[PDB]
Symmetry: D2
Subunit: 417 residues, 4 copies
């Protein structure tokens, strides 16, 4: 167990080290406080939800109460104040429901939980794992009956999101992700994107207060069993968001091999409103690995900090690893993102910008490289301790306690509710 006075001592030394290069470590920690991460609920129960009925880790959540407890446990090890992303299938009601019959009140459970937990809520319509998914197509299906069903869900997703936003007093980002596409090479690339354009326009048609909710649109290059064509491409959705004055969702695992998603922000913000940045680790495909401190995460976080885009960018976690402790998964990803944000915030950005404007690329290379071995860990440790979360390896103690007390017994416990 780290000693709190050692953390405080190491922080004063680091603060001095940074002050000597014109960086204020107190101000950097204050900046990190103001960046809430939207923790995805579906990592807790392998995206089962509650609407419809292998070497994976024990302790999967099977009920609202279980998932809520698991997210509370994860959030108690993530320093600061954050948000939670819900999916439509996480509706809590005993009334018989389908995706086109959900009502705002079906999320009262999550509204009450979020108020008592002190987090905001983001929302995702569920356009997958349903018999109305016809040949991998939903909203942009050539079948009018299939299209009309999913348009109904899409409209309902806004109604729910508006209601949640009104009750919490915090704007709900309503994210749209559609599987729509083909496994093999299509003949017609145009007509599916025109069907999508018209169906999306119909979904966002009825006005709702922007203070309560706003829609984001999430593209993808390719998915399993849908590899050759994605109806909702990144180009289609950036165009759609700018044109219809909505948010654009950038998921870090959904782009080309070698594609740096941190390049997109400064090409979008001269034209568009806001982004939903979904941090996710792709390993040679859209594998949805837990977020770690790697090149991609470091570039995403430093690009948002350096160019001042945080107040127009929502940061969400989107990954799914059931092979490890599901609660640990959230905490690794959240801490990875926070410490990368913090490292970016501990740079003398104004002086570096100056040197770069004067084409002093020598200084820029040297300093950026020296900063990677500066004592950013001491500032991170201080941030963890100040927000009553365990430091470094110490949070494994919390995970072992949660495994003994909950996760390793859960499977044998009778589910109820």
């Amino acid at each position: 167990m780290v000693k709190p006075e050692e953390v405080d001592k190491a922080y004063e030394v680091a603060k001095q080290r940074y002050a000597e290069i014109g960086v204020d470590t107190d101000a950097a920690m204050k900046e990190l406080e103001k960046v809430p991460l939207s923790v995805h609920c579906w990592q807790g129960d392998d995206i089962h939800g509650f609407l419809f009925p292998s070497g994976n880790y024990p302790g999967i959540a099977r009920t609202p109460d279980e998932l809520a407890g698991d997210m509370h446990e994860a959030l108690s090890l993530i320093p600061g104040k954050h948000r939670v992303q819900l999916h439509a299938i996480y509706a809590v009601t005993d009334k018989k429901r389908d995706l086109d019959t959900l009502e705002p009140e079906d999320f009262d459970y999550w509204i009450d939980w979020a108020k008592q937990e002190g987090v905001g809520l983001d929302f995702n319509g569920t356009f997958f794992s349903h018999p109305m998914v016809k040949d991998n197509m939903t909203v942009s299906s050539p079948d009018p009956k299939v299209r009309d069903f999913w348009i109904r869900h899409g409209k309902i997703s806004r109604e729910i999101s508006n209601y949640i936003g009104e009750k919490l007093g915090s704007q709900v980002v309503n994210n749209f992700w559609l599987p729509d596409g083909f496994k093999d090479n299509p003949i017609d690339k145009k007509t599916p994107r025109l069907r999508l354009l018209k169906a999306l326009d119909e979904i966002i048609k009825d006005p709702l207060p922007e203070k309560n909710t706003i829609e984001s649109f999430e593209g993808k290059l390719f998915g399993t069993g849908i590899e050759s064509y994605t109806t909702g491409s990144h180009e289609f959705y950036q165009n759609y968001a700018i044109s219809r004055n909505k948010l654009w969702t950038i998921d870090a695992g959904h782009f080309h091999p070698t594609e740096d998603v941190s390049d997109k922000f400064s090409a979008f913000f001269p034209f568009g409103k806001g982004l939903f940045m979904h941090v996710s680790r792709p390993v040679r495909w859209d594998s949805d690995h837990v977020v770690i401190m790697d090149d991609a995460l470091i570039r995403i976080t430093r690009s948002l900090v350096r160019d001042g885009y945080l107040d127009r960018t929502h940061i969400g976690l989107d990954f799914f690893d059931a092979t490890i402790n599901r609660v640990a998964a959230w905490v690794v990803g959240a801490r990875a993102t926070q410490k990368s944000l913090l490292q970016a915030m501990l740079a003398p950005i104004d002086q570096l910008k100056k040197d770069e404007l004067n084409a002093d690329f020598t200084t820029r290379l040297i300093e950026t490289e020296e900063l990677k071995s500066f004592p950013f860990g001491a500032v991170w440790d201080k941030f963890c301790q100040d927000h009553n979360t365990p430091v470094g390896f110490d949070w494994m103690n919390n995970i072992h306690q949660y495994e003994k007390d909950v996760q390793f017994k859960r499977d044998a416990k009778l589910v109820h509710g």
Copy 2:
């Protein structure tokens, strides 16, 4: 030497093979006639131009030589096409810099285009100049550098307007900027805001759309500018749509495994027009001669199947000096044409119906069979009908041009 009667025989057999699956070979050839390729002048003289004075012999060194080489290439490319000029191909006895060019400096090319019977497209030259400061031009943080290149940009529009008025054919004025960083930048925002402001100033003075319209060409990375490109594909698609201008897709300028044929159907619900630069990247932006490969096949069939040709200008953009430079044009142009023609020789309306009905079996079988249908016999007929040599035969014309012209330089 292929016998015309053999071409005619093969064509009649192919015509019947295609008619049996509801494809009209005569109509397919009429469709191909309507697609002019914009042949880039700079392949002729390794992008030297005329403004600022182990490769294959016979490089063009003068306007007349370059004009003669383009005439030779066009004579071996069936149908009617266009030529792309760079600003540095100005023809004048006057002392010019990129900020002092005048429209009449291109009278030479207007006259040549009229006698050759081709339209002209234009490119501002924002590279190979002392005023390129740290690989930046219009979006340079130095106002002296920015103002110089803004003057050149404005002049590129005035030149393009003048050419368009004289030819009575709209000149597409393509903007490509090297602007970016070799290594990792701190500020990605400000360069792109400087670009936005500069481009807006360049296009400020209204010019008739009947004479010219601007297109904007993004890049992922170039040599010595690998880490950041100010003018990104996203920046320019957004810029084109918002400013009601054309977007330039160069097949060589995207990510590994990136399929540029995906972009058309995501652009046209929002945008006005495309300039599609066919170019072959070999593991980087290598500007290899266009060949019949997956990329070209997908580009051409995507434009044909979704009926985007009337809104897509097709230009060649490559540079290979290791081979006969005139041959380079003909290989690239013929690859593009035969690929367009193969796409036009599909029963597209029936295939679309099969696809709407989720008959993915029929789609796979038929698209694979069409790859070995006799599309070559329709291509050969198109070549012959338009007074150009068939197959290997045009190598005779190259060897004669080498002997009589190129090898004598």
Copy 3:
């Protein structure tokens, strides 16, 4: 229906166009009929096998007799004579078996079928979809019980292979693919590959007649749920094959983005014995799409043909698409491969090589590009007709008849 006179006509015109550039179309077709393709049995029944009993196309095979009939139908529409790959889980027996208790006689069904069908057989041990797959590891597992189990199966794959080869009088290529790897970033990359080296050496220890069987070893870059580290890498297996004088398996789906597997042949053969070339279409991952005529297949086929490597290269199909008629999948993939081989064989290779030796890169570019629009289709159509298979679209009639009479009735 295509008119056979039409085909014969178009062929004679093609024959002359090719003759004019020093290519013999009759000779090219003779070369093609000497290239057997190893048709994978598992496309027919979604790799279910027989050992351990939503937008999926109808008519899936459920029994040996059904799978046998489906492969007979597919082969009937593929011109020339070919081979079939079995997996261990395709054992046909009424006896209680696990992967470590399989007997050669359990493959008597397939030997009898192959002799009647007139095809050779290749083999694959089944190192997946089993409770003894522990944390995605089999032969190279750190758990000795798991190792021993999979080592027993490895040895049995060789024994079965030897028996099939003896009975058929044609060499059985016994292909080893293992899923062994880690989902996330490993600490120790060395020890797993040392465990694999030791285990493989144990599996191939007991000598078996080469005339009957030889082993091939199949690497992978990454798989679903095993993305970060593959124990059996391409580098590992090329080194293992060369050093233990075995075959190396190259699957066209299992390499890096932009990786051209046709580059590997000429870098292997100065050192190595033979290759098992598995044609498979990756679409942005190891997606096992049906093989089509694309840059990869064209480069694979022309690289084998131009450099004379066919006599040392076994060509197998490896793909799994259940979204389309499963019998059609076989025929599309096989015809695409043969088409692409034939186009390679229809080039003036000796003259092009001389042009290249003299650095005449102009002639090489012009000619290779012109050959892409030469009437190779007319020669392919002739090959199809000569070997009593339908021409072009026509074989769709056979699929519709097989759907009505057999597939749609299951």
Copy 4:
């Protein structure tokens, strides 16, 4: 300026943090001392060399003395004991020489400098920038006159390397890199590689003691103007090295998009003798950017120390950036590599290995991620200070002084 007592106090605190997770910082720094980096001479003078006399940062070296002084300055800012790589075109002689008439004594200047400086030397034959490069081919050219010329150079590279090895009493790694290939798609892939095999075998024919020199073979996926085919492929050279019992050169910039060269070590060492690891940063192609602390470098260094391959792996620098202070370029790349090696050496590797063997992938993910924010910087700073080099930003002062006193006065 950093205060030595402040570095020492921060080190003692870090020592304690690492001791508590079973890591010995003092031992970790001793392990780092034993990894010499082979600093490439050609970054100093834009690969001009001296043999054939004939936008960019000022102060390029133009003479042996200027280059020697620049490498001395760079080494003075890189903590510990390292090596220098020479190219054959860095011959120092007033005699009229071609690449096929170089003599060992032509390198006496560099032997004398290395003895003075207290560093070992590695060597590279120069198979580029010469009229005898015919259609981008050298050793494996279809022209027997071209082949024979370059084979003469290849034999001479071994004779030079043996001589240097003897004089310095330190084995010279003689690295072979050939541009040989095609710009566009070849018809015949087989024959070029059979020509290469035959030519390499003739080059290494004459026996020389391993004690003085051993050959390494460097492959490439593609180069500028040689994009479509490389005769000397990675597969060809790994097979060649294992077969002929020589070293295999892995250059981090010469592989496919997304390729992780750190994967290759554990697939090589069950079969082969040794590696020459050229650290180099590719940015979307073989761009030869200065090495920085990124995923690739972190994976290369941790893969070598985790699996205990350092005693069989020579680490060399290979990059060329003339847009920045050329001496600075060396220090950035060397320090990136050392701090990355050091971080990997500061992990509880035995415990992590045990956890992994026991399939505790939860613990492995948590711990590896926590280690990335442990105070490795305080250990790095201690290593820098202990070895009489400036800490953190401080060495920018030395660069500015060297610009003022030496570099900016040259041009």
